[PDB]
Design a protein around this ligand. Structure first.
Ligand SMILES: COc1oc([C@H]2C/C(=C/C(C)=C/c3ccc([N+](=O)[O-])cc3)CO2)c(C)c(=O)c1C
Ligand code: SF4
Ligand code: SF4
Ligand code: SF4
Lengths: 196, 180, 353, 127, 384, 166
């Protein structure tokens, strides 16, 4: 029941409401109103903070508002006190040269680890965090891996007598910016969706 | 709940008198399923011609990229493959290989098919690149197994048994459940 | 030693040498048999390997243990590191002579035992303290406080139940009035199987012997699964082997003393064979104990201490008071049979609620 | 970032590296021995990238048993780096054709790539 | 005593480093250090075709992996509109609940062994061994099986699979009842676990503890009930619950989970009628192996599908599922290309670990091991 | 003294060390559960002499690299190897450890022969428990001096004996 009131609240304030025909909802809040709005969201009855997923759109084919984007997931468990089951996402873009974000650790302690990961994997420093310390990657690791300008850092495959492979030169699969092996890719290799 | 200690003791004793459950490899042949992921085999047609047409569809779909295929053009007098193309060099780095079945799944001629050997433990990285003539269906045993049988003079016995070999393994000779 | 003769000193040295090397072979093959019996318990089967029945595997184990780069870890005490295993082994080997394996001369002529001191149980108690000594000293010497705390756990718990051992061993002394094991065993020959009179105290003795690293506190601890234990984790080739050896010798000596003192040390009412009945009772207790080894959890040494201190020892001293009343007034001895039978019926029937 | 030493001259590379090293303390530095073909060290050729954090140093492919005195020069080199207190050792595996162009890429790209692809190594394999 | 209960030592299964800030035999607070298995799925998966990634998916949670395979599969099916045949769906729920039984077996065996007794590790493992054979029957692999596909499953069930499954399903209920008879009327475990492991549902909710450890504290929150995905809407189901969150209630609730999962295996087994095996859409499914010698479209589609792959439309998607450790999901960003733009995994064992300093606070030092075994981490899932 | 310098004693001590191989588990990933399964009551490496399992490194000779070796764990495991008595052997288990495996990136050591001296390599994902038995038998005959490679050479009994530690 509360998701409908979330939509009525955000649409009334002019925040874009993103929706795919698959049943998952995105709500993009600006940087300023982010902290206070999501505090109100927790107050709205959102027990559970599932995910903090950081995104780097540097090499995305279509342009996007900002390079980095952090998405939180707010949920209210159905089997708890008064559970509607309302689950939704909050996306907040973070500039390329301004990797800031206030934490919701004070509201949910789950953002203790999760935000650290996004600070570990991406250059995004989370404001108000108790401890922003590298979680996963080695302590001496320099950089933030999951951003596209950061190498995957592969090693060749090895064979008998000088015969080797460089997989990035071996891949027949295409990314989004890869034009393809012919002059171009159109039709079903530019995106295909069956109509049930 | 003092009774639980006694109940635990009693059931452990009942299992004590229950002797059997175990299988003693290598003395007892390991029971494998016919679909098991083992050492790759290259299969050949009835004509004797090899099935591999050297098309590198196995190598591209490999998530580790462990398969190497140099092609060449058949010699009409004594051809090796069925078409105009065969596999001069076929290497698979078992230290890269993760045993998917993607090379089996993508092979259009049914040449490359996983076998059943798991006894391929060796000492050296450089030696664990199993080649074409190291995987043919005609061969019976793994690299360390064949080297041990040669430096030992004693024939090869594979330590596994299966209910039957698949039709995709036409020619794969192996011990089948005890039929022999 | 009112009535018992004395062999020459060279026979004492020879028989001690025999007991030491027999304890070597015994603990090796008992490690094998415990492995296989655990296997039978947990379905899996044992090593039908190097043996057949495993009986050359202790040789492989001993040969591996030597040549294993016996290392003196730096940042460790040069002296105690080396000295503690020797303590743990020496004060484990001895205290096995007193256990009578037959009437005098039943060693094919001379003496079943080694020494038959007037005050035996005190000798056992004294040398039993010294095992905990080697444990915690080795813990200190290693220079790793992770093993220090384990040594402290060992010493605290073992010392609590070690105090309880005295309240356990009091009860039969009031009856017999002698501190030599042969007189006690002969008393058990006359009236029969001392635990029949003192089953409760017998219990608190048995359970007390479980606290000495045998199993089920299992918070000695060993380095595994918990705050790592002491007297290991820094010894490589032989000193660790010496710790394992001495601890297992203590295990089998205790499992042999339990029938010797309370039950029928060999001295069977019928068929009166010198050695075989003692060995069979040793094996009986060993097999029940291995059942326990497989079948039960740890105790965490907090409940273990509370149980020993508040539960075992007041109960044992209560039984001591009852038995001391009976002996001082000496009216029957049968009343103790009746009371121990009633006590066992209580401590048993209270289970199946 | 400096480039000292020369290809296929192990002894000259070693002497120039002796001089250019000086009394530089390597307590927090990183040594990347870049090569091709992981397994076969008997015929290996080696480059070195020294990442101090405050300035970086390059040595082209001049060490290893593939060159006369590259095995003894690489042994001396690892002994020299270890004397100065190095603890963090890495090895990078590149395609042979990369090894040449990797010394001509800008410092940020070359160094980022090397740090991403590095394998912790036991120096005993080079001593 | 800030003690270094190091990675993998002493017997911290699932390599994990602990700085136990702790004086005495109590527990003040445990500071964890993870990442000692960081291998790079979220990054490597950005350079592998959707078809390939099914080889990367099971190996994250190597115990209950088909949940990973199913989550990835379902998310991509929704993203490109794939159709589940009824038989494929039934088979997928079979493999899901069976891998759940296997993961549960390993969890309780590890918990018992981690502090306490060694014996009951084997018996449960015995059954697990049998289960593996079933998998080896259909997938040819013990675990890490690459069987699932976007449309459905790779190929059909062998003739010999179902009778073996019936055998194991008939022997299991007595076996699970035996484990519960041994453990529930706990002799010492009662005095070991009923008190320990303080789990206030409020903070368990606040820290992101979904993995079956929360319903042991009395919260009825399961994705199979909250968000039916693979036909769980159509099952008669008992949903385990706990009175008060401790280690004891956790273990008992998971045992009842195993029995309910066996019941679901049987239920799905009965309703199974022959039919198709995967989504026949050629853009999404490679041509059948038999008409590779008749049709040109067959050869072109096989070549393309097995070199390039397929291109789903541009968009982001995410769907949650319930594994033996709770809510799981893949956030898939696709840019219309043959390789996914990004895959972010909600690792239940990753956040379920935030409750380590809390739960074992004031508990025993040894019980810091039993409370970790009871937390059921899979450091392939955490580190990732 | 290294178990050498007597025509009988070197055979004897090689016998002893080879059969009494006492593994030191370093459970890392999904390879390690296939290492655990090699001890259950269907296919147990509990026969050749590996019944007991010394978790402490001061007491065990065989270290099995069982799983993907993430770089943040490389040095620790290194010292775990250095915290072993000198007569020690190391088997490299799996594809992730032997080579880089399928994870060819910044997070994984692409061959664990880098950090530790490997005795035996055993491919598979994970290598079947029975392949692990075959590898421990390979190492068994290797340390007796009963091992030859493809190139015709007999291999030394103990690898990690030929490395200038530092
Ligand atoms: C525990 O579960 C798990 O472990 C591991 C690692 C640690 C490990 C330890 C021990 C102690 C094995 C062991 C078991 C039995 C014996 N034994 O002698 O019987 C000896 C040793 C083996 O793999 C991993 C990675 C894991 O992710 C899970 C869930
Ligand atoms: S089974 Fe998989 S990893 Fe092995 S060669 Fe085939 S496609 Fe590659
Ligand atoms: S094995 Fe099969 S897929 Fe690989 S090149 Fe040969 S014919 Fe093609
Ligand atoms: S080789 Fe396979 S089973 Fe072994 S650690 Fe790697 S992914 Fe896991």
């Amino acid at each position: 029941m509360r998701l409908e009131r979330v939509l009525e609240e955000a649409r009334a304030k002019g925040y874009p409401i993103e929706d795919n025909g698959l049943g998952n909802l995105w709500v993009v809040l600006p940087r300023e109103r982010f902290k206070e709005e999501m505090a109100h969201y927790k107050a709205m009855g959102f027990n559970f903070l599932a995910d903090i997923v950081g995104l780097d759109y540097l090499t995305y084919p279509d342009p996007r508002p900002e390079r980095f984007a952090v998405v939180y997931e707010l949920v209210s468990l159905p089997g708890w006190k008064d559970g509607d089951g309302s689950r939704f996402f909050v996306r907040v873009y973070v500039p390329e040269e301004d990797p800031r974000l206030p934490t919701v650790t004070d509201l949910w302690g789950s953002a203790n680890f999760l935000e650290r990961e996004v600070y570990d994997l991406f250059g995004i420093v989370f404001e108000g965090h108790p401890d922003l310390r590298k979680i996963l990657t080695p302590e001496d690791l320099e950089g933030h891996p999951l951003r596209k300008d950061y190498p995957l850092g592969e090693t060749p495959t090895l064979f008998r007598e000088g015969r080797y492979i460089i997989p990035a030169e071996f891949r027949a699969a295409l990314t989004g910016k890869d034009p393809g092996l012919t002059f171009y890719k159109g039709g079903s290799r530019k995106g295909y969706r069956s109509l049930w | 709940t003092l009774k639980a200690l006694a109940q635990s003791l009693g059931i452990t004793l009942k299992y004590l008198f229950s002797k059997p459950v175990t299988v003693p490899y290598p003395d007892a042949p390991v029971a494998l399923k016919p679909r098991f992921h083992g050492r790759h085999v290259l299969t050949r047609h009835p004509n004797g011609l090899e099935k591999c047409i050297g098309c590198s569809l196995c190598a591209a779909a490999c998530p580790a990229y462990a398969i190497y295929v140099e092609p060449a053009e058949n010699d009409p007098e004594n051809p090796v493959s069925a078409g105009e193309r065969y596999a001069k060099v076929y290497e698979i780095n078992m230290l890269r290989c993760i045993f998917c079945g993607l090379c089996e799944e993508a092979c259009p001629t049914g040449a490359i098919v996983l076998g059943y050997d798991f006894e391929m433990a060796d000492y050296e990285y450089s030696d664990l690149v199993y080649g074409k003539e190291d995987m043919l269906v005609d061969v019976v045993g793994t690299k360390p197994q064949r080297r041990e049988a040669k430096r030992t003079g004693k024939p090869v016995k594979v330590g596994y048994v299966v209910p039957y070999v698949r039709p995709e393994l036409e020619g794969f000779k192996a011990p089948t459940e005890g039929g022999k | 030693t009112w009535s018992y003769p004395v062999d020459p000193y060279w026979m004492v040295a020879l028989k001690a040498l025999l007991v030491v090397v027999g304890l070597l072979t015994a603990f090796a093959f008992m490690t094998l048999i415990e492995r296989r019996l655990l296997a039978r318990f947990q379905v899996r089967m044992g090593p039908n390997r190097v043996g057949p029945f495993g009986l050359l595997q202790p040789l492989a184990d001993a040969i591996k243990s030597i040549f294993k780069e016996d290392i003196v870890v730096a940042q460790a005490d040069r002296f105690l590191f080396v000295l503690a295993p020797l303590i743990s082994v020496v004060f484990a080997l001895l205290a096995f002579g007193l256990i009578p394996f037959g009437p005098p001369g039943s060693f094919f002529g001379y003496q079943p035992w080694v020494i038959n001191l007037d005050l035996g149980i005190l000798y056992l108690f004294a040398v039993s303290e010294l095992a905990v000594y080697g444990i915690f000293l080795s813990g200190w010497a290693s220079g790793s406080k992770y093993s220090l705390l384990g040594s402290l756990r060992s010493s605290a718990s073992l010392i609590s139940y070690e105090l309880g051992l005295g309240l356990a061993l009091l009860a039969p002394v009031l009856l017999v009035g002698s501190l030599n094991l042969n007189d006690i065993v002969n008393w058990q020959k006359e009236h029969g199987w001392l635990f029949l009179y003192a089953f409760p105290a017998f219990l608190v003795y048995l359970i007390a012997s479980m606290a000495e690293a045998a199993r089920t506190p299992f918070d000695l601890p060993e380095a595994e699964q918990e705050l790592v234990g002491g007297y290991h984790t820094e010894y490589s080739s032989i000193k660790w082997a010496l710790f394992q050896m001495a601890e297992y010798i203590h295990f089998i000596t205790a499992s042999a003393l339990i029938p010797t003192l309370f039950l029928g040390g060999w001295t069977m009412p019928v068929l009166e064979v010198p050695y075989l009945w003692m060995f069979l009772k040793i094996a009986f207790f060993l097999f029940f104990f291995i059942w326990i080894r497989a079948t039960w959890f740890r105790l965490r040494y907090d409940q273990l201490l509370r149980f020993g201190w508040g539960f075992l020892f007041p109960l044992a001293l209560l039984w001591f008071l009852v038995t001391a009343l009976v002996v001082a007034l000496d009216l029957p001895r049968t009343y103790l049979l009746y009371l121990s039978a009633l006590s066992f019926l209580v401590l048993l029937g209270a289970v199946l609620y | 970032m400096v480039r000292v030493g020369m290809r296929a001259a192990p002894r000259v590379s070693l002497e120039a590296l002796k001089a250019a090293l000086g009394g530089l303390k390597l307590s927090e530095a990183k040594v990347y021995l870049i090569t091709d073909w992981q397994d076969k060290r008997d015929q290996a050729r080696y480059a070195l990238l020294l990442h101090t954090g405050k300035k970086d140093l390059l040595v082209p492919d001049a060490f290893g048993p593939a060159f006369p005195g590259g095995e003894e020069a690489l042994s001396e080199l690892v002994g020299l780096l270890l004397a100065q207190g190095a603890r963090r050792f890495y090895e990078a595996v590149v395609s042979p054709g990369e090894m040449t162009a990797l010394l001509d890429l800008p410092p940020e790209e070359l160094l980022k790539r090397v740090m991403a692809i590095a394998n912790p190594t036991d120096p005993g394999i080079y001593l | 005593m800030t003690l270094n209960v190091g990675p993998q030592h002493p017997s911290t299964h699932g390599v994990l480093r602990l700085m136990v800030t702790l004086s005495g035999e109590e527990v003040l607070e445990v500071v964890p250090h993870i990442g000692y298995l960081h291998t790079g799925f979220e990054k490597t998966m950005e350079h592998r075709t959707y078809l390939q990634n099914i080889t990367y998916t099971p190996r994250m949670d190597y115990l209950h992996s088909f949940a990973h395979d199913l989550a990835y599969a379902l998310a991509v099916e929704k993203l490109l509109g794939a159709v589940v045949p009824p038989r494929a769906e039934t088979i997928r729920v079979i493999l899901n609940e069976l891998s759940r039984l296997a993961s549960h077996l390993v969890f309780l065996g590890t918990g018992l062994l981690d502090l306490g007794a060694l014996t009951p590790f084997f018996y449960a493992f015995r059954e697990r061994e049998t289960i593996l054979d079933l998998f080896e029957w259909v997938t040819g692999q013990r675990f890490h099986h690459n069987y699932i596909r976007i449309g459905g499953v790779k190929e059909d069930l062998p003739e010999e699979f179902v009778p073996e499954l019936k055998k194991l399903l008939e022997v299991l209920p007595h076996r699970i009842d035996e484990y519960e008879a041994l453990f529930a009327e706990s002799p010492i475990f009662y005095e070991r676990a009923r008190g320990v492991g303080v789990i206030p549902p409020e903070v368990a909710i606040d820290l992101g503890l979904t993995g079956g450890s929360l319903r042991a504290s009395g919260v009825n929150y399961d994705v199979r009930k909250a968000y039916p995905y693979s036909g769980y809407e159509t099952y008669t189901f008992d949903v385990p619950l706990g009175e008060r969150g401790d280690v004891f209630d956790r273990m008992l609730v998971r045992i009842r989970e195993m029995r309910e999962s066996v019941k679901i295996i049987k239920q799905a087994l009965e309703r199974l009628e022959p039919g198709p095996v995967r989504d026949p859409n050629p853009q999404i499914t490679p041509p059948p192996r038999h008409l590779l010698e008749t049709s040109m479209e067959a050869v072109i589609y096989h070549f393309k599908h097995y070199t390039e792959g397929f291109h789903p439309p541009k968009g982001e998607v995410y769907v949650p599922t319930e594994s033996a450790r709770g809510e799981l999901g893949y956030y898939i960003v696709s840019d219309g290309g043959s390789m996914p733009y990004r895959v972010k995994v909600r690792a239940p064992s990753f956040v379920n670990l935030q409750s380590l300093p809390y739960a074992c606070k004031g508990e025993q030092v040894p019980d810091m091991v039993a409370i970790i075994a009871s937390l059921d981490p899979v450091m392939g899932d955490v580190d990732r | 003294r290294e178990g050498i310098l007597f025509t009988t004693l070197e055979k004897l001590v090689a016998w002893g060390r080879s059969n009494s191989l006492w593994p030191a588990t370093f459970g890392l990933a999904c390879c390690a559960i296939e290492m655990m399964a090699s001890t259950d009551a269907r296919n147990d490496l509990a026969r050749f002499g590996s019944e007991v399992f010394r978790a402490s490194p001061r007491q065990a000779d065989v270290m099995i690299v069982a799983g993907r070796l993430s770089k943040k764990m490389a040095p620790v495991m290194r010292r775990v190897w250095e915290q072993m008595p000198d007569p020690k052997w190391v088997i490299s288990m799996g594809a992730c450890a032997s080579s880089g495996g399928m994870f060819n990136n910044y997070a994984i050591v692409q061959n664990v022969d880098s950090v530790v001296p490997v005795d035996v390599y055993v491919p598979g994902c994970p290598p079947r428990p029975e392949a692990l038995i075959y590898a421990v038998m390979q190492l068994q005959k290797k340390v007796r001096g009963q091992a030859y490679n493809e190139r015709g050479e007999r291999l030394p009994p103990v690898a990690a004996w030929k490395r200038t530690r530092g």
